[PDB]
C-alpha cells in the first residue's frame, strides 16, 4: 500500500519548470502538500479536499497545484529559483481532520548551471595497522568527493549483503567548494573479521544526476543517475 | 509601534430554544473592523470601519463562505465535546477561540497565539514554539492527539506566520490611507 510520490530526485536549472505528482491512498479525498527545506521546520503549502482548495498557506504564486478526478494531485512549478531547492512531502488523509499519511517525499535541488553537475569520486582506505593492533576494532573510512549536487545515499555492502550495524555516516555532506561537495563514512569492524581474506567489503555511493529529458552539452559524458562503488578484500597480516 | 490583528470566535449553545448562535469578530490592533453574526435575517460579514468598507466585493463573499464553514464544524464540536465530558444532552455550552498574530514595528512576527476555551475555562492552546500543544484536561489530551495525527499544527503555524502577517500589512495599509 502506501501513498506514492514521483519523481523523487530532480535536477532543474535556474529558471526552469517541473511538475511533482502525488498518488494518494485509494479513497482518500483530502490531499496536502508540505515543503520542507534542507534547513529545518515544516512549511505548510496548500491542502486540497475533494478536488477543491481548502486552505492556502505558504504556496507562492509561481507554484500551482490541482486535484484530478483520480484525486491524485500534481504540483506545477514555474520559474524555479535556488530558494525553491528543498524536499516536498505529500500527506493524504481520508477526510479533513483524520490521520494523514505522508509520501516518500521528493528532493528538488535547483542548480545555477547544469554543467556543474558531476558524479562523485569514491575511494576506500583500509584501516591503519596500528588501529587493529591496539584497539582491535578496524575502521574502513570511505571518502566520496567531487559530486554536485548532494543527491547521494552512501551504503556499506559486505559479502554482497547490505549492512547497517556499526557503520557511521556523516549526516550532512560537507561542501568543499562552491560547486563540489564531499561525503565520508567509516565502518568499524573487528580485527578477526577484517583479517579474514575471504570477506568482501564494498562502499557504494548512489548519485541521482540529470534526467534524460535535460539536454547535455556535448564534449562530456552525461552525469546520469548512477551509483559508483569502491571495494576492498580483507587482508591477513 | 507594534501592531496586532486578532479574531474572537463565539459558539454559544442553546438546546431546544434554537441553534447555536455563532459569531466571529475581527480586531485590528484593538479596534474591531469586521463581524459575522449567525442570528440575522440574512447573515454575512460586515465591515465595522470606513477603511474596511474599501475592501473588494469578492472579499466579503470569499470570507462568508469560510465563516459559514467554520459554523458547521463548531456546531459538530459542541456535540463532540459532550461525548468527551458526558454532558447532559440538553444543556447550554460555549466555545471561545482567540486567534491572532502581533508584529513589531519592523513588520516581523513577534508572537502568534490560538487559545480554545470551554465554558469560561481553558481547553487547549498553541505553544510559543508554534509546533506543539498544551492540553488542559483529559478531553483535550484526546483532541491534541487528533491534531498531531492530522498535521493541524502546521496549518495553524503557516496561517500565523504567513497569512496573518500578510493580511495585517494589507489591513493596516487601508486604515492608514483612510
Amino acid at each position: 500500500s502506501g501513498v506514492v510520490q514521483s519523481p523523487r530526485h530532480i535536477i532543474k536549472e535556474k529558471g526552469g519548470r517541473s511538475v511533482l505528482t502525488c498518488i494518494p491512498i485509494s479513497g482518500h479525498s483530502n490531499v496536502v502538500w508540505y515543503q520542507q527545506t534542507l534547513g529545518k521546520e515544516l512549511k505548510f503549502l496548500i491542502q486540497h479536499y475533494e478536488k477543491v482548495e481548502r486552505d492556502k498557506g505558504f504556496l507562492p504564486c509561481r507554484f500551482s497545484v490541482q486535484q484530478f478526478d483520480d484525486y491524485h494531485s500534481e504540483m506545477n512549478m514555474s520559474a524555479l529559483e535556488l530558494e525553491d531547492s528543498a524536499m516536498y512531502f505529500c500527506a493524504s488523509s481520508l477526510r479533513w481532520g483524520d490521520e494523514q499519511y505522508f509520501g516518500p517525499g521528493t528532493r528538488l535541488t535547483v542548480v545555477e548551471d547544469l554543467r556543474n553537475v558531476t558524479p562523485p569520486k569514491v575511494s576506500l582506505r583500509e584501516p591503519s595497522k596500528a588501529e587493529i593492533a591496539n584497539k582491535q576494532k578496524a575502521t574502513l573510512q570511505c571518502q566520496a568527493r567531487g559530486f554536485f549536487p548532494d543527491h547521494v545515499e552512501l551504503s556499506w555492502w559486505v559479502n554482497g549483503k547490505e549492512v547497517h550495524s556499526g557503520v557511521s555516516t556523516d549526516p550532512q555532506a560537507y561542501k568543499e567548494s562552491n560547486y563540489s561537495y564531499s561525503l565520508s563514512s567509516r565502518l568499524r569492524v573487528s580485527a578477526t573479521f577484517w583479517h579474514n581474506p575471504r570477506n568482501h567489503f564494498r562502499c557504494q555511493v548512489q548519485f541521482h544526476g540529470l534526467s534524460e529529458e535535460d539536454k547535455w552539452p556535448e564534449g562530456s559524458p552525461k552525469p546520469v543517475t548512477q551509483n559508483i562503488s569502491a571495494e576492498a578484500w580483507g587482508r591477513a597480516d | 509601534g507594534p501592531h496586532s490583528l486578532r479574531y474572537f470566535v463565539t459558539a454559544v449553545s442553546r438546546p431546544g430554544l434554537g441553534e447555536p448562535r455563532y459569531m466571529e469578530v475581527g480586531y485590528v490592533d484593538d479596534t474591531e473592523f469586521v463581524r459575522f453574526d449567525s442570528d440575522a435575517e440574512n447573515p454575512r460579514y460586515e465591515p465595522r470601519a470606513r477603511w474596511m468598507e474599501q475592501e473588494g466585493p469578492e472579499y466579503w463573499e470569499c470570507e462568508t463562505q469560510k465563516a459559514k464553514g467554520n459554523e458547521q464544524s463548531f456546531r459538530v464540536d459542541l456535540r463532540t465535546l459532550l461525548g468527551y465530558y458526558n454532558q447532559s444532552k440538553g444543556g447550554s455550552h460555549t466555545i471561545q477561540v482567540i486567534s491572532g498574530c502581533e508584529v513589531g514595528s519592523d513588520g516581523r512576527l513577534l508572537r502568534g497565539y490560538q487559545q480554545y476555551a470551554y465554558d469560561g475555562q481553558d481547553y487547549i492552546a498553541l505553544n510559543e514554539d508554534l509546533k506543539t500543544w498544551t492540553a488542559a484536561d483529559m478531553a483535550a489530551l484526546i483532541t491534541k492527539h487528533k491534531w498531531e495525527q492530522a498535521g493541524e499544527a502546521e496549518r495553524l503555524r503557516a496561517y500565523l506566520e504567513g497569512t496573518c502577517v500578510e493580511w495585517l500589512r494589507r489591513y493596516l495599509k487601508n486604515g492608514n490611507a483612510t
Binding site: - | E24, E63, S73
Partner: peptide, 8 residues
C-alpha cells in the same frame, strides 16, 4: 483574513 477551523 480568517482561519478555516476544522474539527477538533
Amino acid at each position: 483574513r480568517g482561519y478555516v477551523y476544522q474539527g477538533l
